[PDB]
Ligand binder design. Structure first.
Ligand SMILES: O=C(NC1CCCC1)N[C@@H](C(=O)NO)c1ccc(-c2cc(F)c(F)c(F)c2)cc1
Ligand SMILES: [Mg+2]
Ligand SMILES: [Mg+2]
Ligand SMILES: [Mg+2]
Ligand SMILES: [Mg+2]
Ligand SMILES: [Zn+2]
Length: 889
């Protein structure tokens, strides 16, 4: 089982200068002919020529048009093609091969595969070797000349990278297209698509060079009416890179293509971006609101890769966060600017502190630049992406916009057209840092620990105020818990964006200030502070850390009502909730453990409830923010704060807290649910796919959140509102009506009604599946069996499988049933899926990531299922590696 080590990087002894491909698609097989124009590098020491090549059927291989003979001149073991060095030329040579591959039965969706009636490739990370022989690593840059042939009736649209330079007819009903892509690229950015594709198109004129760029968005004919928003998002993405970063697209054409079967969200193949259909296609009649932000961010993400990933690429896969963390950061800047809603940034933090913090305290914890890997298909993590993005964002917080832009342009200008490493980016940021500090001795050497140190830092505070001196002190310390990657953790460069709120009038007491904490602890003193402030700490969530604000709930309430920073307001509310959750959890736990006949629960703080009401009733306050304050923190956020978490006790705790607040605020909730209707459900632009109103969607989020609270509470006659909600044209509304009807006798009536509305659109049906999966039903196990028999069946579409099972795994009371029946069910799905798609099988392991944080009975139950999966004789490399790491074997 080969382990790759970051420190072992060495340049290849070979060079591949030119790739000339002929991909001939036939009904039962695909024939790939490839000529590689190669050379000997300065690092060559006379080694064998070893190509990656996985699952290829060899028809012939040759060197300089001389056919090589198996056994004598080469060996092939279905993974590596080895040409013995005595037969390898010593100067420039041509290697050629013809192989047979089978996209029709390629259900792992890596390499060349068939998704419904579309032939499509996915080559990142090491999938190109599943198409033809190559030295499959991103520092092997080459030019590509690609011809694709296929039946014209089945595959009229042929696409690859670069310029289409010829189209030709072929006897027997076939046709061909030739694409030449002169700029050097790594092979993971190669792509090919063939299908009966329909499109929308537009022309974009770049801001400075005034180049005309042809934009094409493609789907199967059935869904061509769902392409409009994606095209709008692409234009928006191009304008943002031009306006913020001064970067223009360099090619004459950009194609985006939706396919139904895709392992992840989308892929940035040069000029030919390929998308999970659920991340490219939408219409107002057939998509929930979430689709619109999803398409915006994913289209943006792939577009921003054209510079951060494509034009500046990776030396090796250990640098993955250099392109993914930086592109997520660019994507997040873009989405924040396009949506103009504070909930966009809040939603990113909420994901980080639940999913990524859980990963970072799990046995899977790794730094954003790991030291080793076995499976590249398991390398694409929320740590690499989302903690990576926060590390990339901290440069902007440290430098400010002007110097960040200066440093970013240094990075692009110095590395355009080349591979790069994380050091190259830190170096560019350091040059800007010296400029900002006016100090050529300043350096960012300490910053590099963000790339190598795993785990979430904890930052805690103590305060002092001298009223006579008007002097305020913030004493700060940082700590990262030792883990399996570093026994000793070093202090990081932590930027702490801070404000000081005057508690008497709510006003700012100092200018914008970013404290630079570079030691294990430091004391920051402020003079001329006229009154004792309430500190507003880590504004905008300025570092990816556990914040221990050491504030009272009275102080947190004051920030929640009156602070200027949306994150600190949201975090102050989160912290009030967490204090209550931990207190009530321990009270319920003690009652369970001691088998008490009576006991007391500490009520929710009444001033906190008053503050929620105050914000809810503020007509100038933001609807999306309102929906966050009436929602308790995510379960996966809570679990980072409780040892041996009993999920039933936590479910009882949340129930008590929601009921406490509802018993006071339900009339407020109902009144708002009714008063929000007119603006939230406005149909003026329902038939304009170009008109997307993120504030209006946030109003629907608030209505649907309040409806959930009111339905669980059995608010008088709320079933009438649920039924009327089911008649709304907006899928977010009528799918909500299904979810909230779980608490009423009408659930299966609405189940059938919404099924009928959903069944004729592939993506809407998947949203329906998710809604059923997450329904708060006592009979959810029977319902899942019904979905399996009636809808899901033996589909191999990852979107179908993930829709049926993942939402259910977030059902705290039912997935964690003490019998272990939920763990048994998901383990059976994982093992079944692993037979044909190991990457998605490992995705389905997600609920097990917290196994060692649960109560000892549930730890044992989860471990038993993971050991059962590990004992499967046919377990994939992906799944075995993942479960061995997760179970500390
Ligand atoms: O969609 C995404 N979602 C993110 C969210 C948190 C982690 C993943 N990530 C994109 C991306 O970064 N696009 O730019 C992406 C991720 C993985 C692959 C990939 C890698 C492989 F080894 C394969 F075998 C394969 F089939 C696919 C392709 C694209
Ligand atoms: Mg094969
Ligand atoms: Mg413009
Ligand atoms: Mg995103
Ligand atoms: Mg299907
Ligand atoms: Zn990406």
């Amino acid at each position: 089982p080969k382990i790759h080590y970051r420190k072992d990087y060495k340049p290849s002894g070979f060079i591949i200068n030119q790739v000339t491909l002929n991909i001939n698609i036939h009904d039962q097989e695909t024939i790939v002919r490839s000529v590689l124009d190669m050379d000997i590098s300065k690092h060559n020491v006379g080694e064998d020529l070893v190509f990656d090549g996985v699952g290829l059927k060899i028809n012939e291989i040759s060197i300089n048009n001389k056919k090589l003979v198996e056994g004598e001149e080469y060996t092939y073991d279905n993974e590596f093609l080895t040409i013995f060095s005595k037969f390898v030329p010593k100067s420039k040579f041509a290697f050629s091969s013809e192989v047979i591959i089978h996209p029709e039965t390629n259900y792992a969706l890596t390499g060349l595969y068939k998704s419904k009636n579309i032939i499509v490739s996915q080559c990142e990370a090491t999938g190109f070797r599943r198409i033809t022989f190559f030295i499959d690593r991103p520092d092997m840059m080459a030019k590509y000349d690609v011809t694709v042939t296929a039946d014209k009736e089945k595959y009229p649209v042929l696409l690859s990278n670069g310029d289409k330079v010829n189209e030709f007819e072929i006897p027997g009903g076939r046709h061909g297209a030739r694409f030449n892509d002169p700029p050097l690229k790594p092979c993971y950015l190669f792509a090919v698509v063939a299908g009966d594709l329909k499109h929308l198109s537009a022309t974009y004129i770049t801001k400075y060079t005034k180049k005309k760029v042809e934009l094409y968005v493609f789907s199967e004919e059935k869904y061509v009416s769902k392409l409009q928003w994606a095209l709008e998002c692409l234009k928006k993405s191009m304008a943002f890179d031009e306006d913020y970063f001064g970067l223009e697209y360099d090619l004459s054409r950009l194609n985006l293509v939706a396919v139904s079967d895709f392992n992840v969200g989308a892929m940035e193949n040069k000029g030919l971006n390929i998308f999970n259909a659920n991340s490219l296609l939408a219409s107002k009649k057939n998509s929930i609101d979430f689709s619109y932000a999803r398409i915006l961010t994913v289209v943006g993400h792939e577009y921003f890769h054209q510079y951060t990933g494509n034009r500046v690429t990776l030396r090796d896969w250990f640098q993955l966060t250099l392109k993914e963390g930086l592109t997520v950061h660019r994507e997040n800047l873009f989405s924040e600017e396009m949506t103009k809603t504070v909930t966009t940034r809040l939603s990113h933090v909420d994901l980080l502190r639940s999913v990524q913090f859980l990963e970072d305290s799990s046995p899977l914890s790794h730094p954003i630049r790991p030291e080793s890997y076995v499976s590249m298909e398991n390398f694409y993590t929320t740590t690499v992406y989302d903690k990576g993005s926060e590390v990339m964002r901290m440069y902007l917080t440290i430098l400010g916009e002007e110097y960040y832009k200066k440093g970013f342009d240094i990075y692009i200008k110095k590395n355009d057209g080349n591979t790069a490493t994380c050091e190259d980016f830190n170096y560019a940021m350091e040059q800007a840092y010296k400029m900002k500090k006016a100090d050529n001795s300043a350096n960012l050497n300490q910053y590099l620990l963000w790339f190598s140190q795993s785990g979430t830092p904890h930052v805690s505070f103590k305060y002092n105020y001298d009223a006579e001196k008007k002097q305020y002190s913030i004493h700060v310390n940082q700590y990262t818990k030792p883990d399996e990657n570093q026994k000793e953790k070093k202090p990081l460069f932590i930027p702490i964006s801070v404000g000081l709120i005057n508690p008497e009038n709510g006003k700012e007491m100092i200018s914008q200030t970013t404290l630079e904490l570079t030691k294990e602890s430091d004391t920051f003193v402020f003079n001329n502070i006229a009154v004792k402030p309430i500190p507003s700490l880590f504004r905008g969530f300025s570092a990816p850390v556990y914040i221990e604000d050491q504030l009272t709930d009275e102080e947190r309430i004051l920030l929640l009502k009156y602070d200027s920073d949306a994150f600190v307001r949201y975090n102050s509310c989160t912290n009030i909730y967490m204090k209550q959750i931990l207190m009530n959890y321990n009270e319920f736990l003690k009652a369970k453990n001691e088998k008490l006949e009576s006991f007391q629960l500490t009520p929710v703080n009444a001033q906190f409830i008053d503050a929620i009401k105050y914000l809810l009733e503020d007509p100038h306050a933001d609807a999306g923010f309102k929906s966050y304050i009436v929602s308790l923190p995510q379960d996966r956020y809570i679990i980072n704060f409780v040892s041996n978490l009993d999920t039933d006790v936590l479910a009882d705790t949340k129930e008590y807290i929601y009921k406490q607040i509802g018993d006071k605020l339900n009339d407020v909730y109902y009144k708002m649910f009714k008063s929000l209707e007119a603006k939230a459900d406005d149909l003026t632009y329902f038939n304009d796919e170009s008109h997307v109103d993120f504030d209006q969607m946030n109003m629907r989020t608030l209505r649907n959140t309040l409806l959930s609270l009111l339905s669980k509470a059995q608010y008088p006659n709320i079933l009438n509102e649920i039924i009327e909600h089911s008649k709304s044209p907006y899928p977010s509304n009528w799918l909500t009506s299904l979810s909230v009807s779980a608490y009423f006798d009408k659930y299966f009536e609405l189940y059938d009604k919404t099924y009928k509305l959903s069944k004729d659109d592939e993506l809407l049906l998947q949203e329906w599946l998710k809604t059923v999966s997450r329904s708060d039903r006592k009979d959810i196990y029977e319902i899942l069996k019904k979905l399996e028999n009636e809808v899901l069946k033996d589909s191999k579409n990852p979107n179908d499988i993930r829709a049926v099972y993942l939402p259910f795994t977030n059902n705290l009371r039912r997935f964690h049933d003490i019998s272990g029946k939920g763990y048994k069910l998901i383990a059976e799905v994982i093992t079944k899926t692993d037979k044909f798609n190991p990457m998605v099988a490992t995705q389905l392991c997600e609920p097990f990531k917290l196994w060692n944080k649960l109560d000892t009975k549930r730890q044992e139950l989860m471990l038993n299922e993971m050991n059962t999966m590990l004992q499967e004789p046919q377990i994939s490399n992906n799944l075995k590696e993942y479960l061995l790491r997760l179970t500390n074997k």
